[PDB]
Amino acid sequence: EHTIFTQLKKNIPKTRYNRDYMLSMANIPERIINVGVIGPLHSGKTSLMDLLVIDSHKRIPDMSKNVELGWKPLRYLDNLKQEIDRGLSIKLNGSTLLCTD
Amino acid sequence: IESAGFETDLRLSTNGLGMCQLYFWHKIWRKVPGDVLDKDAFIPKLKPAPINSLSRDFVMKTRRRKG
Amino acid sequence: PLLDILVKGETRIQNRVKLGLNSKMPTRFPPAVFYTPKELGGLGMISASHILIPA
Amino acid sequence: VLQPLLPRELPKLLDALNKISKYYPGVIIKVEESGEHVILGNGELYMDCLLYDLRASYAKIEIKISDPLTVFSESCSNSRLGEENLPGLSISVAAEPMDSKMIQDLSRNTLGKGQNCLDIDGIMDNPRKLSKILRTEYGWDSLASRNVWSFYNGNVLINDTLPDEISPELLSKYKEQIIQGFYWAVKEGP
Amino acid sequence: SYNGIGLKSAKGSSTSGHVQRSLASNN
Amino acid sequence: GTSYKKWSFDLPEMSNLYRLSTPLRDEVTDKNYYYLFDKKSFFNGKALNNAIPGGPKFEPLYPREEEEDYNEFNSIDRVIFRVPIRSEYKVAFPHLYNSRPRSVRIPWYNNPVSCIIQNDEEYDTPALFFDPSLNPIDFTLPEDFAPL
Amino acid sequence: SKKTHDMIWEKLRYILQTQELSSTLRESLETLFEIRQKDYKSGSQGLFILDPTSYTVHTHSYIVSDEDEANKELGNFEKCENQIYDMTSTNDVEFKKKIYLVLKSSLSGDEAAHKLLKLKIANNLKKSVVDIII
RNA sequence: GGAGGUCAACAUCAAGAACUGUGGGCCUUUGCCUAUAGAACUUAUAACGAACAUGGUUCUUGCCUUUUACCAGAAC
Ligand SMILES: Nc1nc2c(ncn2[C@@H]2O[C@H](COP(=O)(O)OP(=O)(O)OP(=O)(O)O)[C@@H](O)[C@H]2O)c(=O)[nH]1
């Protein structure tokens, strides 16, 4: 009712990049950078993030065949049910993922 | 005070072309056209008050709400 | 409320006549049937209920 | 402005307004002597997002609402007596406008880099430095520059009088008492 | 538009429920 | 096949069909146009017992408004009348201008304001053109090297 | 001649976006660009006082690189040796009913003033509608 | 052996965002933790159907001599 969330560990999408290798990077301070994304309405910010995640993770349970194919954008960051209905972003939501330059 | 339903009227009258975003940043405050203490000028209820004295209105109202 | 109750009453009596025969068709029962005075052979009912009601 | 519809649900409405205070950082919740609660927010859509979470997510109560309103503020545009209720003390305070440029600057809290006017918040740093800062930009008063006393959630104060010359020993005892008596005053209004 | 005027609906009504603004009373 | 399900077409055929069907399937193509007209606004108008100017009218859903709590809260003494609050606001932001909304759906808010442009007259105008509507706005590499 | 005009606009357009021009000149130049989107709707109003077939349409096909004649010499002086009147009020009587019936319906006076103002009577009759009400 | 069938049977298709199988560990197989293999169809301005009918019960109504036939909103 409030949010669309994954509450079981077995269902967390498996990550190709091997999480425990990511946990190693956490020690070195220069290794990690915290970057927030900002901008005006409907510039693609949340749908930009949606690129990095699907490229990062191997299988996602919340992908319909419709959002995978093209037509409807998947929005991972817009978890809240209000944000889904309101068609908008209300509360900030991030993700922590490793990616190579 | 004038911005209630400002956005919809813009988007309804223009048939969905158009848009509005109302922000506060500059923090510009501006005087209300009335004279904060006058016991007379106001003219009756259930209409938006005439701009000649709007300040006695806002005062005599907030006060009644507050106490 | 008095005006509202007038509008209900007058329509309820006209419905009394209509259901009395067998129709609610407007076309059969033009207002001359209810409103012509009895001297011309109508009901001669006296209508206070048309108006327009302040809302 | 809020009030719960069934007044026996007031204890529940409080638990949520403490939550909503947390989750939405730009919200300002108040309570008056009229019993009502005031909710402040950036704009329409932002209020609309609270009241959905308020009604549905957090507090399951149903609540009355005011008409859309605003927040106002008071100012002045150009002799004196004031007296204690146990009249040992008598206080006299004049008020004046602040030059449009001055508040223009105060509206931006700033560290005073380059030719921009430093904010009043730097009073911890040398007040005589501030006296130069004020007199440099605005042609501010020479006597009042060193006499600018403290600042606020808003405008600025000045001590100019003979008693400040008479008893700066005894007055300096009562100053941190006076500034307490200001915030208490200007957080509200006449 | 229904701006607070007219009826909850015209069923118990006996009327059509047509609401029109008054020309007489404005100023 | 003969069972006749699952069709597949090529491009120009679809171009022909879309060309033929203009008297029927001609319609608006922005989410933005629909605005208050989309379902959710109709479901609201039904739940709140309002009406959009061209929208349908139902029965109240909560026919009892008649209970009243007589209180100083909303009194005319205490209200600042500066705006009508036309019913389109009650449907547009149902949780704010409204009080006691029940069985109300969230309305969807906004779209990007489509700028889409096509000229329908001359098919022989190119595909890429600058429309009247728009605002006016030391070393070398080897030869044979070109764009991809 | 849409296409030639269009071509000219394209050339004219070419200068503004990718070329350097005097500021006063450019702004006027841009404004014409603005109008094209606008459509000239303050530039198509005038004295078309011959019908398109009453102008015997001698559309003279000059080009501004001919060498032409201009016969200044014909501007010298020279030496040329060469119906029922209606006495019925039936038109009016129908308009005394209409008012009188609007008037004998209608509780109160504010809902009989809605009806009259809703007819939009012409200014000619509005003088004589008061005559009926009195 | 392939391409098909206005052919048939059987299984399945609204759920902690939501499936199974397997190896190991605690319990002593239900259940919990952990590693792993495979996930067709249906879903986010929510769904097998870019479509849209009828009935039943119980509430609140409307027509009002009574039942059928009905007015129109809700829940199931
Ligand atoms: N035509 C077009 N539309 C796009 C493109 N990218 C995004 N959109 C649409 O524009 C909207 C922006 O998507 P979002 O990511 O949800 O916008 P946002 O950046 O999250 O906006 P916020 O509410 O401020 O977070 C979406 O409705 C997309 O469908 C694009 O590249 N082309």
mmCIF file with all atom_site columns, N, CA and C and ligand atoms in Angstrom, chain A residues 40-47 73 75 88-89, chain F residues 112, ligand 1:
data_model
loop_
_atom_site.group_PDB
_atom_site.id
_atom_site.type_symbol
_atom_site.label_atom_id
_atom_site.label_alt_id
_atom_site.label_comp_id
_atom_site.label_asym_id
_atom_site.label_entity_id
_atom_site.label_seq_id
_atom_site.pdbx_PDB_ins_code
_atom_site.Cartn_x
_atom_site.Cartn_y
_atom_site.Cartn_z
_atom_site.occupancy
_atom_site.B_iso_or_equiv
_atom_site.pdbx_formal_charge
_atom_site.auth_seq_id
_atom_site.auth_comp_id
_atom_site.auth_asym_id
_atom_site.auth_atom_id
_atom_site.pdbx_PDB_model_num
ATOM   1  N N   . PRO A 1 40  ? 15.998 20.143 -13.165 1.00 0.00 ? 40  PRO A N   1
ATOM   2  C CA  . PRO A 1 40  ? 14.585 20.543 -13.187 1.00 0.00 ? 40  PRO A CA  1
ATOM   3  C C   . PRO A 1 40  ? 13.614 19.357 -13.443 1.00 0.00 ? 40  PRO A C   1
ATOM   4  N N   . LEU A 1 41  ? 12.313 19.623 -13.622 1.00 0.00 ? 41  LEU A N   1
ATOM   5  C CA  . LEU A 1 41  ? 11.338 18.532 -13.850 1.00 0.00 ? 41  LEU A CA  1
ATOM   6  C C   . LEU A 1 41  ? 11.628 17.682 -15.088 1.00 0.00 ? 41  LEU A C   1
ATOM   7  N N   . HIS A 1 42  ? 11.370 16.385 -14.940 1.00 0.00 ? 42  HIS A N   1
ATOM   8  C CA  . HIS A 1 42  ? 11.287 15.475 -16.041 1.00 0.00 ? 42  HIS A CA  1
ATOM   9  C C   . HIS A 1 42  ? 12.444 15.634 -17.024 1.00 0.00 ? 42  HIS A C   1
ATOM   10 N N   . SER A 1 43  ? 13.616 15.919 -16.489 1.00 0.00 ? 43  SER A N   1
ATOM   11 C CA  . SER A 1 43  ? 14.802 15.979 -17.294 1.00 0.00 ? 43  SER A CA  1
ATOM   12 C C   . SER A 1 43  ? 15.408 14.592 -17.503 1.00 0.00 ? 43  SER A C   1
ATOM   13 N N   . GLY A 1 44  ? 14.905 13.599 -16.810 1.00 0.00 ? 44  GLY A N   1
ATOM   14 C CA  . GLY A 1 44  ? 15.434 12.256 -16.965 1.00 0.00 ? 44  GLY A CA  1
ATOM   15 C C   . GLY A 1 44  ? 16.284 11.754 -15.816 1.00 0.00 ? 44  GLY A C   1
ATOM   16 N N   . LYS A 1 45  ? 16.301 12.493 -14.722 1.00 0.00 ? 45  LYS A N   1
ATOM   17 C CA  . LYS A 1 45  ? 17.178 12.132 -13.623 1.00 0.00 ? 45  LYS A CA  1
ATOM   18 C C   . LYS A 1 45  ? 16.921 10.722 -13.114 1.00 0.00 ? 45  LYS A C   1
ATOM   19 N N   . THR A 1 46  ? 15.687 10.434 -12.759 1.00 0.00 ? 46  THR A N   1
ATOM   20 C CA  . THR A 1 46  ? 15.363 9.110  -12.249 1.00 0.00 ? 46  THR A CA  1
ATOM   21 C C   . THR A 1 46  ? 15.483 8.077  -13.329 1.00 0.00 ? 46  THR A C   1
ATOM   22 N N   . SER A 1 47  ? 15.116 8.426  -14.554 1.00 0.00 ? 47  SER A N   1
ATOM   23 C CA  . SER A 1 47  ? 15.269 7.487  -15.683 1.00 0.00 ? 47  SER A CA  1
ATOM   24 C C   . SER A 1 47  ? 16.718 7.397  -16.147 1.00 0.00 ? 47  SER A C   1
ATOM   25 N N   . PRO A 1 73  ? 9.115  3.365  -19.224 1.00 0.00 ? 73  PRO A N   1
ATOM   26 C CA  . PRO A 1 73  ? 10.313 3.429  -18.444 1.00 0.00 ? 73  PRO A CA  1
ATOM   27 C C   . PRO A 1 73  ? 10.167 2.751  -17.112 1.00 0.00 ? 73  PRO A C   1
ATOM   28 N N   . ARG A 1 75  ? 11.191 2.650  -13.352 1.00 0.00 ? 75  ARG A N   1
ATOM   29 C CA  . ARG A 1 75  ? 11.770 3.630  -12.460 1.00 0.00 ? 75  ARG A CA  1
ATOM   30 C C   . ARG A 1 75  ? 12.131 2.973  -11.165 1.00 0.00 ? 75  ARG A C   1
ATOM   31 N N   . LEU A 1 88  ? 5.872  11.316 -10.444 1.00 0.00 ? 88  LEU A N   1
ATOM   32 C CA  . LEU A 1 88  ? 6.769  12.372 -9.973  1.00 0.00 ? 88  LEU A CA  1
ATOM   33 C C   . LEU A 1 88  ? 7.678  11.811 -8.922  1.00 0.00 ? 88  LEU A C   1
ATOM   34 N N   . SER A 1 89  ? 8.698  12.581 -8.575  1.00 0.00 ? 89  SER A N   1
ATOM   35 C CA  . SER A 1 89  ? 9.588  12.198 -7.511  1.00 0.00 ? 89  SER A CA  1
ATOM   36 C C   . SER A 1 89  ? 9.305  13.079 -6.293  1.00 0.00 ? 89  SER A C   1
ATOM   37 N N   . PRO F 2 112 ? 5.617  16.634 -19.976 1.00 0.00 ? 112 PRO F N   1
ATOM   38 C CA  . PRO F 2 112 ? 6.675  17.533 -20.408 1.00 0.00 ? 112 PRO F CA  1
ATOM   39 C C   . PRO F 2 112 ? 6.328  18.739 -21.286 1.00 0.00 ? 112 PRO F C   1
HETATM 40 N N1  . LIG I 3 .   ? 10.980 12.080 -25.620 1.00 0.00 ? 1   LIG I N1  1
HETATM 41 C C1  . LIG I 3 .   ? 11.772 11.720 -24.576 1.00 0.00 ? 1   LIG I C1  1
HETATM 42 N N2  . LIG I 3 .   ? 11.202 11.603 -23.347 1.00 0.00 ? 1   LIG I N2  1
HETATM 43 C C2  . LIG I 3 .   ? 11.919 11.243 -22.255 1.00 0.00 ? 1   LIG I C2  1
HETATM 44 C C3  . LIG I 3 .   ? 13.322 10.984 -22.424 1.00 0.00 ? 1   LIG I C3  1
HETATM 45 N N3  . LIG I 3 .   ? 13.828 10.677 -21.240 1.00 0.00 ? 1   LIG I N3  1
HETATM 46 C C4  . LIG I 3 .   ? 12.816 10.733 -20.345 1.00 0.00 ? 1   LIG I C4  1
HETATM 47 N N4  . LIG I 3 .   ? 11.688 11.061 -20.957 1.00 0.00 ? 1   LIG I N4  1
HETATM 48 C C5  . LIG I 3 .   ? 10.377 11.199 -20.320 1.00 0.00 ? 1   LIG I C5  1
HETATM 49 O O1  . LIG I 3 .   ? 10.371 12.368 -19.500 1.00 0.00 ? 1   LIG I O1  1
HETATM 50 C C6  . LIG I 3 .   ? 9.939  12.033 -18.172 1.00 0.00 ? 1   LIG I C6  1
HETATM 51 C C7  . LIG I 3 .   ? 11.123 12.129 -17.260 1.00 0.00 ? 1   LIG I C7  1
HETATM 52 O O2  . LIG I 3 .   ? 11.374 10.879 -16.661 1.00 0.00 ? 1   LIG I O2  1
HETATM 53 P P1  . LIG I 3 .   ? 11.809 10.859 -15.160 1.00 0.00 ? 1   LIG I P1  1
HETATM 54 O O3  . LIG I 3 .   ? 13.128 10.226 -14.987 1.00 0.00 ? 1   LIG I O3  1
HETATM 55 O O4  . LIG I 3 .   ? 10.727 10.191 -14.307 1.00 0.00 ? 1   LIG I O4  1
HETATM 56 O O5  . LIG I 3 .   ? 11.896 12.439 -14.811 1.00 0.00 ? 1   LIG I O5  1
HETATM 57 P P2  . LIG I 3 .   ? 12.658 12.882 -13.480 1.00 0.00 ? 1   LIG I P2  1
HETATM 58 O O6  . LIG I 3 .   ? 14.024 13.336 -13.871 1.00 0.00 ? 1   LIG I O6  1
HETATM 59 O O7  . LIG I 3 .   ? 12.623 11.675 -12.551 1.00 0.00 ? 1   LIG I O7  1
HETATM 60 O O8  . LIG I 3 .   ? 11.729 14.059 -12.929 1.00 0.00 ? 1   LIG I O8  1
HETATM 61 P P3  . LIG I 3 .   ? 11.576 14.220 -11.347 1.00 0.00 ? 1   LIG I P3  1
HETATM 62 O O9  . LIG I 3 .   ? 10.107 14.112 -10.981 1.00 0.00 ? 1   LIG I O9  1
HETATM 63 O O10 . LIG I 3 .   ? 12.025 15.650 -11.057 1.00 0.00 ? 1   LIG I O10 1
HETATM 64 O O11 . LIG I 3 .   ? 12.457 13.181 -10.627 1.00 0.00 ? 1   LIG I O11 1
HETATM 65 C C8  . LIG I 3 .   ? 9.472  10.599 -18.191 1.00 0.00 ? 1   LIG I C8  1
HETATM 66 O O12 . LIG I 3 .   ? 8.053  10.655 -18.189 1.00 0.00 ? 1   LIG I O12 1
HETATM 67 C C9  . LIG I 3 .   ? 10.047 9.983  -19.451 1.00 0.00 ? 1   LIG I C9  1
HETATM 68 O O13 . LIG I 3 .   ? 9.038  9.194  -20.045 1.00 0.00 ? 1   LIG I O13 1
HETATM 69 C C10 . LIG I 3 .   ? 13.858 11.129 -23.762 1.00 0.00 ? 1   LIG I C10 1
HETATM 70 O O14 . LIG I 3 .   ? 15.041 10.918 -23.899 1.00 0.00 ? 1   LIG I O14 1
HETATM 71 N N5  . LIG I 3 .   ? 13.072 11.474 -24.773 1.00 0.00 ? 1   LIG I N5  1
#
